[PDB]
Amino acid sequence: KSEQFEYAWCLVRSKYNDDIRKGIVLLEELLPKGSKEEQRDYVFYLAVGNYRLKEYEKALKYVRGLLQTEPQNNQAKELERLIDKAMKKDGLLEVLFQ
Amino acid sequence: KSEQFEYAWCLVRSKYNDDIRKGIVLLEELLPKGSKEEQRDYVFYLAVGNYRLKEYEKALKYVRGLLQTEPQNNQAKELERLIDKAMKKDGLLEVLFQ
């Protein structure tokens, strides 16, 4: 189980979008199985994976879910601040042609 | 066993040089364990991993070892032709200051 995560961790790291989609799904499967601390890590990495796929909605959903339980996790705060920059630049680009 | 390779396959794919070094080592461990066909695949991927680490010597050692048994594997031939281009450009760059 602690190695089924390492696989998904490497997968959510990969340069190929398909390895990333596979990495999330393995993390979504490992999520109810997990412990308190394990779920906090899995959720963080699900936000990382969803962000690397421009799925910024779902990525913000996780990182805020974690930030409600851990308001002072600075790495979660930094990941939420990176999701906000991508979304506001993306929203600017969308409406550039009016 | 057929999943200990998938891990190392994803690892030898990664953007991080340390995940790659780990991926090779897992493939070097899986190499005697393997079957005929499995060893041919592992060796191919060891050449891929060693090439992505600029270890072009070791990468050529594998891809030629495979090419001796499989002279017509075109993917092994293409990987050996990519290792030759990297080495000849690298050798040109080394001696640019004379």
Residue numbers in the entry:
A (entry chain A), B (entry chain A): 32 to 129
Quote the passages of the study that discuss this structure, keeping the authors' original sentences.
A tetratricopeptide repeat (TPR) motif containing mitochondrial outer membrane protein, mitochondrial fission protein 1 (Fis1), mediates mitochondrial fission by recruiting large cytosolic GTPase, Drp1, to the mitochondrial outer membrane. The cytosolic domain of Fis1 is composed of 6 tight α-helices with two anti-parallel TPR motifs forming a concave hydrophobic surface. Fis1 interaction with Drp1 occurs during cellular stress, but not under physiological conditions, suggesting that cellular signals during stress activate Fis1. Human Fis1 protein contains a single cysteine, Cys41, in the entire protein.
Each of these mutants was previously shown to be sufficient to increase Drp1 recruitment to mitochondria and subsequent mitochondrial fission in cell-based studies. Consistently, we observed that the first 30 residues including the α1 helix were missing from the structure providing strong evidence that the α1 helix undergoes significant conformational change and is potentially disordered in the phosphorylated forms, whereas it was intact in the WT. We crystallized the phosphorylation-mimic mutants, Thr34Asp, Thr34Glu and Tyr38Glu Fis1, and we observed that in all the cases, these mutants crystallized as covalent dimers mediated by Cys41 disulfide bridge between two Fis1 protomers. As Thr34Asp, Thr34Glu and Tyr38Glu Fis1 have a greater propensity for a conformationally altered N-terminus and hence have more exposed Cys41, they crystallized as covalent dimers. Upon closer examination of the crystal structures, we observed that the concave hydrophobic surface in the covalent dimers of all the phosphorylation-mimic mutants was exposed. Here we showed that Cys41 is also oxidizable and mediates Fis1 covalent dimerization through disulfide linkage.
